[PDB]
Curated annotation (Swiss-Prot), chains A, B:
Belongs to the GST superfamily. Omega family. This is Glutathione S-transferase omega-1. Residues 104-228 form the GST C-terminal domain. Homodimer. It comes from Homo sapiens. The gene is GSTO1. Changing residue 138 to D: In allele GSTO1*C; no effect on protein stability.
């Protein structure tokens, strides 16, 4: 269980990825890295995980990703892939299993346009995590409700269970991690004028891949308190 | 030639796209829409163009794209695709001809990672267009030089003529429009510590697709002066 402890400044650079496996450089509480892990699980891809201490990074990690961000994929050929959506698309294409993106070009384009509709939400969550008082909170509630009604409208026309059809697909996994953290951020009442989006969240929680990877509110809250202080122990909260 | 005049507020909504053609909603001076037009030309795709008056938009255009931005693709089946990179990827997949993206998943992922390396540049150009004096200009020069050295490093390792190999490909067309406007913005001396990137620009200008679509400095400058004043005649400069 302590096998999951993060590597930080001073850690030895890791050795090569074994043939037959792919490696993800991750952090247990990162919603960006969660995207990639949901895909690895959904597709049944054998993999290893190296967690990175984002508040005390190893210098060698910048050789994996010059941006110094998680997630990063590394394969046995030594190829390196970064940016969460890029890593997810690469896995869908490079591995067998349930295809998570549509083959049809228009339907694929639709999933990417829905990701665009969503793309303000990660930056807002970033802002929210920093909110100081009830006035700031009232305002961020309105900002989230505007973004959520964009997403509600997609579901309203499609009349489908999920954003790509009646079966969960790539787009759902790409947006899920921010919704998972919404309870914990006290932002559930932003989805109260968006009834189909609320039902979508209930459906997501029933998905075997989502349920396997869900972090408890108490664990995310422990992480967050330490992260907001730039604690070098945040990323290993619980361990 | 006046066939290219933009549609603005009050214009009638256009009729259906004919079978055998795709329609692009564009603007002659938009670098985002230029991406899509470079792809249409590179692939030899039969198409029609409707230019939109971005400073006096038709209300119906928001039914084509709720964001109200160009480019937008519309096909004879009535499907609508927006966001410049999405439109380009859709065309590469949906049409025959020279494939502009690699089939190999890693090499495709590499092109998307290079687009990420570039992705600060459009926002910087946006800021530059607004620059007031020599001090602001000196600063933006340093910002551009930082972004350009990221791109130089890609070319340095690859030792290839273009960002995807020795043959021009999607990634080159996606980044080109901002480099085309660099002379006009007086920012050529930002590429003077980036010699491979300077050679890339010379190579791009020799490409038949790029050369066919290049706008003159004088025409772009006429456009820009009117655009900065929110002139409803900017988009039709020259007509
Ligand atoms: O700020 C971030 O955005 C990226 C990217 O992976 C998502 O597209 C990432 O990993 C972060 O930590
Ligand atoms: O500001 C813009 O960015 C978009 C997009 O098309 C690019 O990805 C666009 O068209 C604009 O006018």
């Amino acid at each position: 269980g302590e096998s999951a402890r993060s590597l930080g400044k001073g850690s030895a650079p890791p050795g090569p990825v074994p043939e037959g496996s792919i490696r993800i450089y991750s952090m247990r509480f990162s919603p960006f890295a969660e995207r990639t892990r949901l895909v690895l699980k959904a597709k049944g891809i054998r993999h290893e995980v190296i967690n990175i201490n984002l508040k005390n990074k190893p210098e060698w990690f910048f050789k994996k990703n010059p941006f110094g961000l998680v997630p990063v994929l590394e394969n046995s050929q030594g190829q390196l892939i970064y940016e969460s959506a890029i890593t997810c698309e690469y896995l869908d294409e490079a591995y067998p299993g349930k295809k998570l993106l549509p083959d049809d070009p228009y339907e694929k384009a639709c999933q990417k346009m829905i990701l665009e509709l969503f793309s303000k939400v990660p930056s807002l969550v970033g802002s929210f995590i920093r909110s100081q008082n009830k006035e700031d909170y009232a305002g961020l509630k309105e900002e989230f409700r505007k973004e959520f009604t964009k997403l509600e409208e997609v579901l309203t026309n499609k009349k489908t269970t999920f954003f790509g059809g009646n079966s969960i697909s790539m787009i759902d996994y790409l947006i899920w991690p921010w919704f998972e953290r919404l309870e914990a951020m006290k932002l559930n009442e932003c989805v109260d004028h968006t009834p189909k989006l609320k039902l979508w969240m209930a459906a997501m929680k029933e998905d075997p891949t989502v349920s396997a990877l869900l972090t408890s509110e108490k664990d995310w809250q422990g992480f967050l308190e330490l992260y907001l202080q730039n604690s070098p122990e945040a990323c290993d909260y619980g361990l």
